[PDB]
Design a binder for these strands. Structure first.
Ligand SMILES: [Zn+2]
Ligand SMILES: [Zn+2]
Ligand SMILES: [Zn+2]
Lengths: 732, 205, 150, 18, 298, 100, 91, 115
DNA sequence: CTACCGATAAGCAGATCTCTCGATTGCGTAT
DNA sequence: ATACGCTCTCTGCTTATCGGTAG
RNA sequence: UAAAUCGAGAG
């Protein structure tokens, strides 16, 4: 998607309607005749499944449009079926409305009073007046039935008029979940009781019971087969008589189009062949395996030719008629089953080739594999390796990714300082550009170019447009993913939303693995024993905004499962805390100052004073000493914003008051006015624990200050463990 | 079990009296807390039949709320002979609403006279379903019908269409207890664990 | 100590513009073919959960199979329009009529000249929508997509 | 040429010609 | 599609209102952590007061009316609660039902206000009581879930992800495959069914000692029971839904496509599933509003 | 030219019916997280395509940084349109909104 | 045979023209509409006049110097209606 | 434990049974085609044999290169696929492990009850 | 007396995370 | 030598044959 | 250039 190509029209909604035979024959670019895909010598056989006029095919200008293989969208053709056959989608609908009728009166076997009652109830549900219809039922010789029907009609029309005049329902109905529920219940009861009529009510003469042994065939009993054209004509007559009653069973919003619903929709008068573009042959080096859809259409075309020939033989004219009639009937049945197979691959009789329904039904179908979860562009995957010195809101992109992934930045008067030198760099000299998308939309390439010509191109990035029509737009440079950009990092499986965060990218110089800070371990539930995860690189500013602000790693400190935190340093830093903030921890002036500058380097903005401040030594004589408590205190004092007091907090940790000696008070932690005066930092303080110091900093100074505190605490505990080890042994 | 049947009958009568009071009809706690001796000395089932009327406050809130008649059958079963008798009785005193009680079962022939005479709605109840009041259980919150002014205000507050609200099926035990009608929105007071008491709603359908 | 055979030179991949599954126009599947990565249901639901609407619309639509397809305004179909051979515009087929029954006349490469049907405009959609349109019109189901600015 | 950047999406006549 | 509207009422994509107040108080669980940590709030009173800066948060917010009504209902409630819950005629709504917590200061829930009052009535201790309650109520005003939050997605993740760690089959007996909800619904009605659903979908989580916020269990139960019945989370429940494309994209695509096309169903493309299928922006969060630019010339 | 006029008139009449008047709206006066994110993204896009520059450029090149600088001084010339479920919309200018 | 035809188009405005939206619509669409035959009008457009931008807020005075212009979601472009009378020449 | 040598013998036996059945069906086709046969002539024996599939070895090679058991007669095995394991030979541990592993069956992999 | 509505008893349909490799992809017959 | 004929689960719904009740 | 089925693995 290009931001410089604006789209005005938008799809408000779509509606699911049956396509009719007459409509198809008007749109089609051609109807196909022969069941041969393509003749020898390599050209496609005119009139076959492929054709010049069904879409440009393998270096053959399309006849329908006149454009090449890339610039031909494809055009739709149709197959003239000699006879109308069942549509397997609607066979249960056709088989419910095939029964429940009197074949003589050509009404339903239900008394027209009940039929009209259901019609008006469903018309009231068309407009949402659900309770009004329940009173419509509260209305209780043949010439009086006409008056009863007229009274119900007046009642319904007047209720509709009042609701529309009351500002309660517009001209397009009011359809919602509850009204849908009652409509479904009403229709299901309608059908359940509509088959309860074994004897007609308009003219009480019995009718045969239609018995279907399986799809593609329906049998009558007083056994006898019934042709499909008979079923079509029967239900055509029934629908003609009861068009007013089925107009409200096959509709939910007011049919403002007022187009009559037929029985032609229930039958396959024509099959539709998608453009050739959608049945291109499986090409595998030399192997060419034609489409299963092409094979099924070839089979249906073969059956069409055979049944047409049998019909013609019968037309050119006893016993010969008997055998030709048996063969014609079998041709009918076989083409019916072949159409049923071209649509559905499980109703057939005969492992079977996938049908067009089978491209949708379950997972790996067109819904749960190419619409819900697609396969994305401008993304990368790798294996994660840990890396402190990464700010807990950053991710370390390897140079390979840092040179492949790109972003289209449009050139302005203020950007040509850096995009010009990015073009000068080239596609390999990081940072740099890999493409220039011009005003005309042309994508000038830089991969195969010389540095001299690259600089020459750079000298014309921000030129005026000599095109009257493109004066609005400007050139874009596909710059490499710089240090300022944002990346949506996810690690499958995504059991919760916090597992797909947005990090700021740091372009590491060395190795091919996504280097990620330790804090996010619980957030992704990740390890580093070869865990793989993916980085998605958004391509427009509006997408950058959400990962930078809404899904930003700072914004993700508390999981909404309980509001608890799922950040905090994990394994080494916790034990470094149990040791560094001990009473035994005393630090000379040099050691303490190095520890403080080792993590709060004020050359990028670690501390909020622009000149490090120290703390008076805890033990003055004999020589100036310090404590780890003071280390935590001065780290907090440096990271915390100025013109604001320090934190006050009382809490506990997991280490009892017996594991420190008699009369000890290290188990209870106390921060007073931004100074650590008692207690040892633990898992409870920083880690996956609630109400600790880092949680309190989050709640008081904001989430960003808590993120900076996590980075500095990690860096400090690391620099302290790289100057003082911590090991498990066999004596332990 | 004659004494036990009398005890269950008195308990059901108390629950029915309370249910009548809940809908907004003239009953007091002195009538409601009618002890077992009171029930024996006043009714020891056609003698248990009675009439109730709205209070002045209920009339102000519900202008169209009419009289109510409560009945108790004698035979453990009810047929169209009694049901038509009850419909004729409703038409005799022109009650707006009426309710019915059966001991063992009611025939569909009797049920065939439920929507017989609208808008004079007539309801129907058992005795065992009313041995224990359902609304006294801890789990069920309090339900309150809203006057059409209150319902209209509720719909305009959220700009809702009528059916877009959460639904309560008309066959819900609460709806039967409170005699709800389709389109009558109910305000429910839920005592939440995370927010205490708060007001939700349900449209009866 | 043992060196296991799960090295990084086998398990790192980075995707940009390139090969696409031509029937559904989403990038091909495979490390060897330089194919993209799946953003499945569990990733889409998480992306929605953060409230990230533009992010999800960029991962799901703008990057994989975004296409500016012409749609006829009146008939509401995508795969019905076509280009017109000059003697240069876009016209429709379903709601255009043959010139035998009738300026606004446009001709195909077959020479069959039609009139009308010039009520079409651009709509940005996933290509898989067009493919579902085809695989539904094969079954006889017609999806009519009414544009907003009629 | 002749895209949404350079041509109106829908151009109607408000009334009859005058 | 179940998100937070601008009435602070949670509803589907189409609009079928699911609940009127998120959890009954509309408090974001990501901002609920230190709302009842009163001692912490008082100790760091100056830092919090600096962070909220009520200087520019009063020129467009009403205080007096909401505080008055909160006091009145607090007094009325203290007048009551001698009797059980059914007899407790309201006569007075909770402040959240009447007043918008994000527009009127002091519009706070009953349990929160009662616990704050208990704290201020057991701890009589430069900070006064009125300024402390002003700061706490402003903090509550800032601890409300923003409009347009995918509370359905968050609830689903927060009930499914922790379920990874009786147990999962019990969940399947309550969420997916219909003490017993059926008995309590057939005897005591729909609200008793909702309470039973929440209680049983909680105590299984409790036995695993996972803290599960009731703003999720309430949303789940109020989506299941939206029809007055015990709609489980299977294809039977989904059948009663306005948008076709969601149902087609879920499962049994054939049956739902038939049902969609036989009714000529015109789905309005509001569900998250549908808007992707047709290429439009989503209806949760960033897409839950438009943006229009003011231009100077006329 | 006459059915078109009816179409336009019905469009604008339903538009005015939905549009809540300025002095009646009851939405939260803060600029929520989603609104802030979308405003920043949209104004950044505009800046990239040579939109007007109000706030001074202290060497910034990331358009999201220029958008943040505009949001700091509330110079962003956009308008949120919060939609109610019914379809009724309340327009809030960026300036009227109090962020955090 | 010069006819004044009042048209009502749906034009799209660039970010660079938020300062002069009237001149923006004139430079983007109306200027690419002069002297060219138009089938949607009927003749050949000699000129334009009375360019008037509609509003996205119905509650604004007819002379509100600032009108809301809806912004397309994916792009930084605005799309809005404009009523304008063209002096067309029809043979 | 079925060792895969006994399985090999079993599938070989079934294949040669299929061979005999194919030549008998060839005889049947010749009998019901116009006869012109004489069962005691080497010419006719060479005529019937040379038209039928004697390539039993390639069917064993198929069972090895794909692992799919094509059994005209239903066997006493409860599965039909996944019988040949590629000896990857990355370690002698991998390779020597190939030859000591039983498998319950590709039937039991897709099952719910974990007893 | 028969017709209509329930009611289990039986039969039936659809379901129960991303990623990398490898190999293989039809007999059979009448010309 | 090759082209053309092809016997391991769980939730519902739907169909079905035996009961009465009421004119 | 595909797409399926079987097998081997990573988390
Ligand atoms: Zn073409
Ligand atoms: Zn008849
Ligand atoms: Zn058209």
């Amino acid at each position: 998607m290009d931001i410089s190509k604006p789209v005005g029209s938008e799809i408000t909604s779509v509606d699911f309607g049956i396509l009719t035979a007459k409509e198809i024959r008007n749109l089609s670019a051609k109807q196909i005749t022969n069941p041969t895909v393509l003749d020898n010598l390599g050209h496609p056989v005119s009139g076959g499944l492929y054709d010049l006029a069904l879409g440009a095919f393998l270096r053959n200008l399309c006849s329908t449009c006149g454009l090449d293989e890339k610039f031909c969208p494809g055009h739709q053709g149709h197959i003239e079926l000699p006879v109308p056959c069942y549509n397997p989608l609607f066979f249960n609908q056709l088989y419910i409305y095939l029964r429940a009728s009197c074949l003589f009166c050509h009404h339903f076997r239900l008394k027209s009073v009940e039929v009209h009652r259901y019609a008006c109830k469903l018309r009231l549900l068309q407009y949402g007046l659900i309770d009004e219809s329940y009173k419509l039922d509260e209305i209780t010789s043949s010439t009086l039935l006409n008056e009863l029907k007229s009274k119900r009609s007046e009642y319904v029309d007047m209720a509709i008029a009042k609701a529309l005049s009351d500002g309660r329902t517009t001209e397009r109905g009011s359809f919602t979940a509850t009204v849908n529920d009652e409509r479904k219940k009403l229709v299901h009861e309608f059908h359940k009781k509509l088959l309860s009529r074994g004897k007609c009510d308009n003219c009480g003469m019995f009718s045969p019971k239609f018995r279907k042994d399986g799809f593609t065939k329906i049998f009558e009993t007083a056994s006898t087969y019934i042709l499909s054209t008979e079923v079509k004509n029967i239900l055509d007559t029934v629908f003609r008589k009861e068009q007013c009653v089925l107009q409200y069973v096959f509709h939910s919003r007011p049919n403002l189009s007022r187009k009559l619903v037929k029985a032609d929709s229930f039958f396959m008068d024509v099959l539709v062949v998608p453009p050739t573009r959608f049945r291109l042959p499986s090409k595998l080096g030399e192997e060419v395996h034609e489409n299963s859809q092409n094979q099924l259409l070839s089979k249906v075309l073969t059956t069409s030719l055979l049944i047409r020939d049998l019909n013609d033989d019968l037309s050119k004219l006893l016993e010969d008629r008997r055998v030709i009639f048996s063969r014609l009937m079998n041709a009918f049945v076989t083409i019916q089953n072949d159409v049923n197979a071209f649509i559905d691959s499980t109703k057939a009789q005969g492992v079977p080739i996938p049908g067009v329904k089978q491209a949708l039904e379950k997972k790996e179908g067109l819904f749960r594999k190419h619409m819900m979860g697609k396969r994305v562009n401008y993304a990368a995957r790798s294996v994660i390796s840990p890396d402190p010195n990464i700010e807990t809101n950053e991710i370390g992109v390897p140079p390979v990714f840092a040179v492949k992934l790109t972003y289209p930045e449009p050139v302005t008067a203020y950007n040509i300082a850096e995009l010009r030198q990015a073009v000068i760099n080239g596609p390999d000299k990081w940072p740099g550009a890999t493409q220039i998308q011009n005003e005309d939309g042309s994508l000038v390439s830089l991969i195969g170019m010389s540095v001299e010509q690259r600089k020459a191109l750079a000298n014309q990035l921000l030129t005026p447009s000599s095109n009257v029509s493109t004066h609005t737009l400007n050139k874009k440079v596909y710059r490499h993913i710089k240090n300022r950009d944002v990346v949506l990092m996810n690690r499958q499986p995504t059991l919760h939303k916090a597992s797909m965060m947005g990090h700021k990218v740091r372009v590491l110089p060395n190795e091919k693995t996504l280097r990620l800070h330790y804090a996010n371990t619980g957030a992704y539930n990740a390890d580093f024993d070869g865990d793989e995860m993916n980085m998605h690189f958004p391509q427009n500013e509006n997408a950058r905004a959400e990962a930078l602000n809404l899904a930003n790693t700072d914004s993700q400190y508390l999981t909404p499962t309980s509001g608890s935190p799922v950040r905090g340093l994990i394994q080494d830093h916790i034990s470094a805390g149990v040791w560094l903030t001990s009473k035994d921890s005393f630090f000379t002036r040099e050691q303490y100052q190095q520890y403080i500058y080792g993590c709060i380097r004020p050359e990028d903005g670690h501390t909020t004073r622009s000149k490090i401040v120290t703390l008076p030594p805890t033990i003055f004589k004999p020589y100036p000493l310090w404590t780890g408590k003071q280390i935590i205190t001065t780290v907090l004092l440096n990271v915390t914003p100025p013109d604001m007091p320090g934190i006050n907090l009382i809490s506990k940790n997991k280490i009892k008051n017996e594991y420190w000696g008699k009369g000890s008070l290290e188990n209870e932690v106390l921060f007073k006015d931004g100074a650590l005066l008692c207690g040892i930092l633990d898992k409870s303080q920083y880690g996956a624990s609630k109400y600790g110091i880092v949680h309190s900093l989050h709640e008081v100074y904001g989430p960003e200050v808590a993120a900076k505190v996590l980075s500095v605490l990690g860096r400090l505990f690391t620099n302290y463990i790289t100057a003082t080890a911590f090991t498990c042994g066999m004596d332990d | 079990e004659n004494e036990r049947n009398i005890s269950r009958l008195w308990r059901a009568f108390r629950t029915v009296k309370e249910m009548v009071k809940d809908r907004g009809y003239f009953i007091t706690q002195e009538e409601v807390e009618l002890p077992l001796e009171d029930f024996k000395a006043k009714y020891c089932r056609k003698m248990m039949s009675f009439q109730a009327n709205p209070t002045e406050e209920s009339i102000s809130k519900f202008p169209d709320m009419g009289s109510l008649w409560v009945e108790f059958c004698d035979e453990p079963s009810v047929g169209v002979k009694t049901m038509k008798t009850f419909v004729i009785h409703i038409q005799e005193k022109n009650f707006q609403t009426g309710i019915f009680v059966y001991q063992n079962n009611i025939t569909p022939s009797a049920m065939k006279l439920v929507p017989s005479i609208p808008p004079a709605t007539i309801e129907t109840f058992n005795e065992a379903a009313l041995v224990v009041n359902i609304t006294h259980h801890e789990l069920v919150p309090k339900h309150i019908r809203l006057s059409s002014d209150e319902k209209r205000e509720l719909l305009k507050r959220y700009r809702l269409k009528e059916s877009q609200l959460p639904r309560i099926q008309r066959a819900d035990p609460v709806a039967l207890y409170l005699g709800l009608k389709r389109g009558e929105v109910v305000k429910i007071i839920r005592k939440s664990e995370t927010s205490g008491r708060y007001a939700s709603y349900r449209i009866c359908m | 100590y043992q060196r296991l055979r799960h090295m990084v030179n086998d398990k790192f991949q980075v995707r940009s513009t390139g090969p696409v599954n031509s029937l559904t126009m989403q990038p091909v599947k495979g490390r060897k073919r330089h194919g993209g990565i799946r953003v499945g249901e569990m990733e889409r639901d998480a992306l929605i959960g953060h409230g990230t609407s533009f992010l999800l619309q960029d991962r799901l639509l703008n990057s994989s199979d975004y296409t500016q397809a012409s749609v006829c305004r009146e008939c509401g179909s995508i795969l019905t329009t076509q280009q017109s051979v000059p003697r240069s515009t876009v016209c429709c087929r379903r709601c255009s009529m043959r010139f035998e029954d009738a300026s606004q006349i446009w001709e195909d490469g077959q020479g069959n000249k039609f009139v009308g049907g010039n009520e079409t405009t651009t709509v940005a959609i996933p290509f898989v929508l067009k493919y579902l349109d085809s695989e539904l019109s094969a079954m006889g189901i017609r999806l009519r997509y009414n544009v907003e600015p009629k | 040429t002749a895209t949404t950047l350079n041509t109106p999406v829908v151009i109607h006549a408000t009334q009859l010609p005058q | 599609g179940v998100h937070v509207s601008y009435d602070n009422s949670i509803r589907d994509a189409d609009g079928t209102l699911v609940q009127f107040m998120y959890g009954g108080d509309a408090i974001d669980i990501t901002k609920e952590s230190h709302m009842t940590q009163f001692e912490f709030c008082l100790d760091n009173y100056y830092a919090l007061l600096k962070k909220y800066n009520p200087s520019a948060l009063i020129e467009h917010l009403d205080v007096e009316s909401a505080l008055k009504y909160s006091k009145k209902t607090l007094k009325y409630r203290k007048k009551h609660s001698k009797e059980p819950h059914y007899k407790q005629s309201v006569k007075y709504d909770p402040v959240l039902a009447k007043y918008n917590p994000a527009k009127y200061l002091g519009s706070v829930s009953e349990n929160f206000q009662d616990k704050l009052e208990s704290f201020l009535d057991k701890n009589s201790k430069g900070v006064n009581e009125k300024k402390f309650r002003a700061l706490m109520q402003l903090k509550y005003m800032r601890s409300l879930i923003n409009p347009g939050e995918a509370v359905g997605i968050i609830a689903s993740q927060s009930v499914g992800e922790p379920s990874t760690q009786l147990g999962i089959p019990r969940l399947r007996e309550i969420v997916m495959t219909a003490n017993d909800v059926a008995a309590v619904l057939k005897t005591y009605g729909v609200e008793a069914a909702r309470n039973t659903i929440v209680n049983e979908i909680n105590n299984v989580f409790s036995r695993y000692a996972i803290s599960v916020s009731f703003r999720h269990l309430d949303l789940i139960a109020d989506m299941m029971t939206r029809q007055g019945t015990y709609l489980a989370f299977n294809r039977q429940g989904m059948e009663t839904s306005t948008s076709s494309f969601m149902k087609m994209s879920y499962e049994t695509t054939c049956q739902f496509l038939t049902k969609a096309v036989l009714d000529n169903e015109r789905e309005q493309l509001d569900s998250p599933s549908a808007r992707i299928v047709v290429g439009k922006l989503n209806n949760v969060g960033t897409g839950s509003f438009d943006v229009l630019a003011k231009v100077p010339n006329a | 030219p006459e059915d078109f006029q009816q179409h336009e008139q019905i469009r604008r009449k339903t538009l005015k019916e939905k549009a809540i008047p300025k002095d009646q709206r009851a939405t939260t006066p803060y600029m929520t997280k989603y609104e802030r994110a979308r405003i920043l993204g949209t104004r950044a896009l505009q800046i990239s395509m040579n939109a007007p520059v109000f706030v001074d450029l202290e060497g910034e090149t990331d358009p999201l940084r220029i958008a943040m600088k505009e949001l700091a001084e509330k110079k962003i010339p956009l308008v949120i349109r919060r939609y109610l479920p019914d379809g009724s919309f309340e327009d809030w200018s960026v300036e009227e909104l109090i962020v955090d | 045979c010069i006819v004044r035809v009042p048209i009502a188009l749906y034009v799209s405005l660039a970010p660079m023209y938020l300062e002069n939206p009237l001149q923006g619509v004139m430079k983007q669409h109306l200027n690419p509409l002069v002297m060219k035959y138009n089938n949607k009008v009927g003749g050949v457009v000699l000129g334009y006049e009375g360019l008037k931008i509609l509003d996205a807020d119905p509650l604004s005075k007819e002379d509100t110097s600032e009108k809301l212009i809806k912004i397309t979601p994916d792009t930084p472009f605005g799309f809005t209606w404009c009523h304008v009378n063209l002096y067309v020449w029809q043979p | 434990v079925l060792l895969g040598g006994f399985l090999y013998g079993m599938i070989l036996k079934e294949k040669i049974d299929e061979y005999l059945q194919n030549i008998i069906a060839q005889v049947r086709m010749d009998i019901n085609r116009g006869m012109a046969i004489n069962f005691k002539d080497k010419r006719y024996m060479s005529r019937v044999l040379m038209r039928v599939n004697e390539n039993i070895g390639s069917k064993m090679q198929y069972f090895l290169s794909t692992g799919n058991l094509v059994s005209q007669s239903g066997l006493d095995l409860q599965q039909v696929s996944g019988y040949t394991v590629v000896a990857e030979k990355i370690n002698f541990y991998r390779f020597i492990s190939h030859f000591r592993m039983v498998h319950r069956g590709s039937f039991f992999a897709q099952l719910k009850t974990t007893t």
